[PDB]
Symmetry: C3
């Protein structure tokens, strides 16, 4: 009955991918000073099957301190967008997460730092030519820096898997893409302050100001949808593919800190950021990390370097200090199919105000 | 009866499979030569007529001396990719396949590899991997009185890939030779004076007038399939594969005006897999700053990807893991080739922000087409 | 064609197993020791489900107790922390038996990039070498102590999705044996002028370098909750009865400008070949070689190429070059099988041959038990 439903969906998906034509087009641009406004509600266009949004973000920042500079934080330009929230034409919320978490998922799905330029020995002048994602390492006292950042906000899982896409052929009922940008308070961290959400940190932080930020949203969708008597993958279009994040506190030295997957959700990936009191360490404050089921079954209890080794196989490098990734794409964590599962971190040292920022990528049935 | 087609397709696929399973791949040298570009620079190579030919790997080396008393020269953006100026291939029936510039062929080699062709990636590995063998290499500058050594490789494709033989050539034994023509760089194309257009040059600088090749040398390796499988009906072969042309060609168009859409029409018949547009802004090559946007559209005013230069570059970063050189723009249509007939006329669009004198768009295309 | 049945069946059982079992990676052993006391260890894997391989983590602290002279990493560096590996399955059949450097080069070939490396990019976001997964200081100055980390994957199964070579460790009696021979104070340090092939550091202070200590941790990767069907467990019988092994050998007798041929044996389906030209302790970037090739019985070469062009094919495989004097050959799609087409040999025609020259060969292959 469902075995048949599954097959029909996949076939409709296949026909839709074969007959419709992919389009990516600008839906809105705005230039502004976050000192004036930092939250914008973009109204996507209602056209065919929407797969996602590519959001271009640029900014000019000035360090007016008399003598001190500021330097990029570990997340840097990824913190230009503080949060993103999307609602479909039914006002059903899909993704709702931080710019840094969205960016880390973009990297994970690309298999390499998102839209980066790889360095090679080629004498031909390939390289960072176009500065697609870019930000100066430091901004000296009295200097102005230019930054460029891109985020892909997904609806559909991928280019070929339309699970999570949105049918937006629904006139009168619009979608909504909420972008909440960085501002002078969030973007600059004083020495000693927590740099988690900031773009720059340093002794010149107090006198740093955005001169402006601008964004351009491009909506990617499928046009010329195939018609029989309309071919649509009904499971695909009624599943939500979402990203979300949360914070957890309560870490104690040498004790297993467990974060339950309160599932029914099919978790494709998990990111755990160990914000150790504003301190971000390269695994030295952790004994091990693991994923486990009640049955004390640790399917992957690993020391930090070996955990990182698994990630190097996924994105060809390490995520920034204190950021840990876990891929469960092929076999998504689904609790009422494996029984309560949890993500575990056993800290070796815990600073005051220590916490785990959890980011999840998952599928779930709509309505 | 459009079944005849889907029938022929299935048989072509079937045979391609059998041919790939049964035959055995060989790569062998067909010719090597060292010469002085002052004496000659155009060569016609006669490949061996054996089995099904997939392509040619062309190794080129050169020694260049900057004889200037005081000034240096530095690599242009294309650099060693300009060691071969033009490449043209003719099959045993004398039908032309690829006919393009060395730089265009190279950018396509890169596009198809998914990274700068034959480059050595840099990593944190303590083990001594790296640029050990200098496969594609050229000194960044050649000082006054110094001699630099360069190495460049080009893959001239007949077959689309190692597993897709569309475009491959049966070097039967028509007693009709194939021909691979190579027009190399020479002392008049390789060196650009300051202020001169660097497009086709290898080095540019104040010492350019006194630069010369000591020698250029090339080696052509032919890649083919041997031991072709025979059945009852005789030799089993994907006749659609073998009767299709997979070619690269380039062209030039002028007439750009600031803020006006400059449209290059795609021709009919051809199924365009990729498009490269080089904005030679009168000898100036800029990192997108002289362009408003680029697009692909249908006369039906429908742009399927009208994008600002940075967002266009972002798409390319997804394909080759980096940016192509300044002023070089890439467009991948591999999954759904541009085909005017299944879509109506289509054109590649560039709306320039600034246009210098003698501005032009150099177009490079990868496409499939029927022998008839 | 009654074999198409068996194969068709094997492939189906493979998919069911992959689809139904759940992957586990777990520590089976950890140990710290002083190479001065012992350097050979026999690890005993857990006998659970289908075993795919072992991830071996190795850390070491090396002290250069020399008065004034430093030492610098050799081309292989930390890849020589493990000198050799040998694996015996529950039926006492050996699988891999090779050098640590050969195993490491195969790990790289299979990943398609230097194994567990961190690629450098222009990203402003701080990705990079954050965790030093495989790491070793370029030099250890007189009086200093350096910390190294190395990882090796010992394969049983060919890949995550191809279980050819995997081991059913339900077979209880007879434990499996994972034997590891580590570097020690005699193999890790080469004096200037000495052959650096097996060493980790080479230099004027080598004679006074020593291991402060070495430590290792073996993680076993396997499939659990095997699917049970009508007539019992659903298993890919062809996969589980095929051996996927890496092995090394050495050959000498090279003469300038003469083809040196190393014959491939029959029965084995060789997936890859690695040839290291240890030219009397000197390792050159192709300049001591005229060409390399793979040749058939009587016919000619199917790959006679100059060293740079040979290196070009490798660049398409691992996105970079292997260290000096190390040559790779991928035959994964059409394995070399002498039964398929007469004896085949690997050929190296050397340009210059030093005293004590030799080719150190490394092979990856499939064979039935």
């Amino acid at each position: 009955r469902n075995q048949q439903a599954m097959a029909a969906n996949l076939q409709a998906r296949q026909i839709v991918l074969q007959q419709s034509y992919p389009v990516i087009q600008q839906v809105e641009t705005q230039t502004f000073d976050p000192a004036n406004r930092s939250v914008f509600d973009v109204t996507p266009a209602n056209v065919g099957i929407v797969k996602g949004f590519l959001v271009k973000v640029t900014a000019a920042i000035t360090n007016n301190h008399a003598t001190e500079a500021v330097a990029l934080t570990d997340f840097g330009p990824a913190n230009l967008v503080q949060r993103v929230i999307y609602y479909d034409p039914d006002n059903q919320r899909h993704t709702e997460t931080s710019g840094w978490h969205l960016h880390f998922v973009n990297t994970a799905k690309q298999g390499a730092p998102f839209l980066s330029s790889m360095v090679t020995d080629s004498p031909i002048k390939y390289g960072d030519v176009m500065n697609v994602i870019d930000a100066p390492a430091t901004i000296a006292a009295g200097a102005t820096g230019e930054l460029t950042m891109y985020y892909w906000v997904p609806l559909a899982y991928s280019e070929t898997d339309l699970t999570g896409a949105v049918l937006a052929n629904v006139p009168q009922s619009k979608q909504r893409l909420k972008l909440e940008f960085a501002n002078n308070n969030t973007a600059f961290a004083a020495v000693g302050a927590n740099p988690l959400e900031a773009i720059y940190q340093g002794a010149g932080a107090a006198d740093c100001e955005f001169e402006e930020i601008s964004y351009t949203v491009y909506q990617s969708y499928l046009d010329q949808l195939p018609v029989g008597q309309y071919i649509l993958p009904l499971i695909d279009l009624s599943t939500l593919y979402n990203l979300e994040n949360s914070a957890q506190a309560g870490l104690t030295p040498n004790v297993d800190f467990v974060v339950q997957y309160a599932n029914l959700y099919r978790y494709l990936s998990t990111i755990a950021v160990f914000d150790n009191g504003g301190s971000f360490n390269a695994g030295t404050d952790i004994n091990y990390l693991s994923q486990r089921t009640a049955n004390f079954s640790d399917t992957r209890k690993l020391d930090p370097k070996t955990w990182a080794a698994q990630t190097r196989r996924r994105i060809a490098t390490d995520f920034p200090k204190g950021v840990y990734y876990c891929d469960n794409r092929d076999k998504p964590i689904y609790t009422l199919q494996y029984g309560n599962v949890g993500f575990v971190v056993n800290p070796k040292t815990v600073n005051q105000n220590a916490r785990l920022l959890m980011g999840y990528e998952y599928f779930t049935s709509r309505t």
